[PDB]
């Protein structure tokens, strides 16, 4: 009856809270929660469409509802296929992120920090603010300019791009800035 | 009855479409549409909460629903107050964007392109890709590295920060990169 409306209101409140906090803060766990919510978004839409269709007032409404449900389902299946292809290529669990199918590997201090990249571009910039590193708008922890990675890479289905550190500048002692430019590509 | 569910499904579909297109593409009109939808998000939550409260199954559900509605309402009112303060300071219609209360003025080729900034930071980076300029993740049209603005500014309620071009590098002929570092602050 009204339970659907209440849960929808709670969902919108949660989305607002994540939006107003995850935008300013890029904590890894908050980021993962936002990813999980974004993934959940699709089944919510499918459930809404099917529930509207089953209680269709007239034939046209049910038909359009089921058509939209099928559209969302095929979109979800295609995105799952691409995600599984990316996982097979990179064998990393980050490939199943609902954001996209491009991964950014950052060899930071012994480990490699893989993050979803929204677009593979010729230039990716790095900015260090108060000692905290952000590459492609992703908080990768504490780092300083002198030990910044000299090479990163971006992994996509049937492609692998390698970047190298361009010019690196130091701003106000602890803050800083840098860029990563493509110099190589590897298919398969 | 089920009209609310169908409109909610359509709203989620529209949000997905904007998310999957506005993320990769930063067209000004698409950006404005996304801003309008994000603004609409709040009244949708308020309507859902009030509709749940009026048809409360039990007293506790209605009480929590009205409490959440009041919380959302006071948040909306406070954000409106901050937005109006920013507009009074800057007298620009961009100050009413639902994203935040920080504006980025970019003096680009005679005009000034004001965009909502999600955080005022000591360093803001600029990247030119194939001749298209993005500052703080905002598409500001066609530009090249040599004529890049030598000074930008970030406007906030009771503060005004001025940046100046740091090091500027050219990548692969047409693409490029640059940074903007704070050198001054102006209160009031």
């Amino acid at each position: 009856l009204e339970q659907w409306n209440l849960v929808i209101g709670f969902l919108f409140l949660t989305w607002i809270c994540l939006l107003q906090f995850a935008y300013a803060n890029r904590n890894r766990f908050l980021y993962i929660i936002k990813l999980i919510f974004l993934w959940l978004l699709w089944p919510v839409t499918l459930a809404c469409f099917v529930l509207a269709a089953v209680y269709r007032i007239n034939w046209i409404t049910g038909g359009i509802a089921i058509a939209m449900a099928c559209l969302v389902g095929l979109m979800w299946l295609s995105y799952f296929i691409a995600s599984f292809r990316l996982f097979a290529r990179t064998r990393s669990m980050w490939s199943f992120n609902p954001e996209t199918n491009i991964l950014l590997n950052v060899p930071l201090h012994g480990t490699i920090l893989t993050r979803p990249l929204l677009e593979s571009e010729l230039v990716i910039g790095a900015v260090i603010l108060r000692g905290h590193l952000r590459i492609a708008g992703h908080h990768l922890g504490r780092c300083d300019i002198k030990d910044l990675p000299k090479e990163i890479t971006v992994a996509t289905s049937r492609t692998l791009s390698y970047y190298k550190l361009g010019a690196s500048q130091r701003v106000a002692g602890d803050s800083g800035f840098a860029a990563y430019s493509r110099y190589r590509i590897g298919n398969y | 009855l089920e009209q609310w569910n169908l409109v909610i499904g359509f709203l989620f579909l529209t949000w997905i479409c904007l998310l999957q297109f506005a993320y990769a593409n930063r067209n000004r009109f698409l950006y404005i549409i996304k801003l309008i939808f994000l603004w609409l998000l709040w009244p949708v939550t308020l309507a859902c909460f009030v509709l749940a409260a009026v048809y409360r199954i039990n007293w506790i559900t209605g009480g929590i629903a009205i409490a959440m509605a009041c919380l959302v309402g006071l948040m909306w009112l406070s954000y409106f107050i901050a937005s109006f303060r920013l507009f009074a300071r800057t007298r620009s219609m961009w100050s009413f964007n639902p994203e935040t209360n920080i504006l980025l003025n970019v003096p680009l080729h005679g005009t000034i392109l004001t965009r909502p900034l999600l955080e005022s930071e000591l360093v803001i980076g600029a990247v030119i890709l194939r001749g298209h300029l993005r500052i703080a993740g905002h598409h500001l049209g066609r530009c090249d590295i040599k004529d890049l603005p030598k000074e930008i500014t970030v406007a906030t309620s009771r503060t005004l920060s001025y940046y100046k071009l740091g090091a500027s590098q050219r990548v692969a002929g047409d693409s490029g990169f640059a940074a903007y570092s704070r050198y001054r602050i102006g209160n009031y």
Partner: antibody, heavy 113, light 112 residues
């Protein structure tokens, strides 16, 4: 900066395998891919392949597939290249670069009996 | 496959002049509208030294007298002013398609 120290020259009989090490210093060994290059006759630079020393997946030239195998030892930061079934054609200098910027000094391989 | 064809096989220029090294690709090496073409320098008995990458990007620490140009199939390396320590061999490499191929190399001679 980064350093790449290889094994010295090695005289190898025909048809006998050998291993060319490339010890890395000045940077975390895992994080930069290691390319291998061959310069024959003193001027013909030929790409052999690259290895990601983190997960261990390589990518060879199809000419050197089955002739060269790329391995790593994260413990000692030492990358390896093993030449299989050496021939008079394989006499050359084998370099190891990382980001196309830092190279080794070259392992001169002489395949003669 | 790709075959980088350098030209000329040997060069001879006096000091203070400009030296131009060509490198033609059998096929266009464009990717996403960009050409990935490195230029190396190898003095005798020494490993190659990267000068340019992405066909126009000067490597960090290289004197700003090497310039990478060209696009499509025809690429070009320009040295000006040719100095006393530029006698070496210059190679063009495409970091675009497996296998990454080198050019035959052109020997830069200094006139005196």
């Amino acid at each position: 900066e980064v350093q790449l120290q290889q094994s010295g020259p090695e005289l190898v009989k025909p048809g006998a395998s050998m291993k060319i090490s490339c010890k890395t210093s000045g940077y975390s060994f895992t994080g930069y891919t290691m390319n291998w290059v061959k310069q024959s006759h003193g001027k013909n630079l030929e790409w052999i392949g690259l290895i990601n020393p983190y997960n261990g997946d390589t990518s060879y030239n199809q000419k050197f597939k089955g002739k060269a195998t790329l391995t790593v030892d994260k413990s000692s930061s030492t990358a390896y290249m093993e030449l299989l079934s050496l021939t008079s054609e394989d006499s050359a200098v084998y370099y190891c670069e990382v980001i196309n910027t830092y190279w080794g000094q070259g392992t001169l391989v002489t395949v003669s009996a | 496959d790709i075959v980088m064809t350098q030209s000329p096989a040997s060069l001879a220029v006096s000091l203070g002049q400009r030296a131009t090294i060509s490198c033609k690709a059998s096929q266009s090496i464009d990717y996403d509208g960009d050409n990935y073409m490195n230029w190396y320098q190898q003095k005798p008995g020494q490993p190659p030294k990267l000068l340019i990458y992405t066909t126009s990007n000067l490597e960090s620490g290289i004197p700003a007298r090497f310039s990478g140009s060209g696009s499509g199939t025809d690429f070009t390396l320009n040295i000006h002013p040719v100095e006393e320590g530029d006698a070496a061999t210059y190679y063009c490499q495409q970091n675009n398609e497996d296998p990454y191929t080198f050019g035959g190399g052109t020997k830069l001679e200094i006139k005196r």
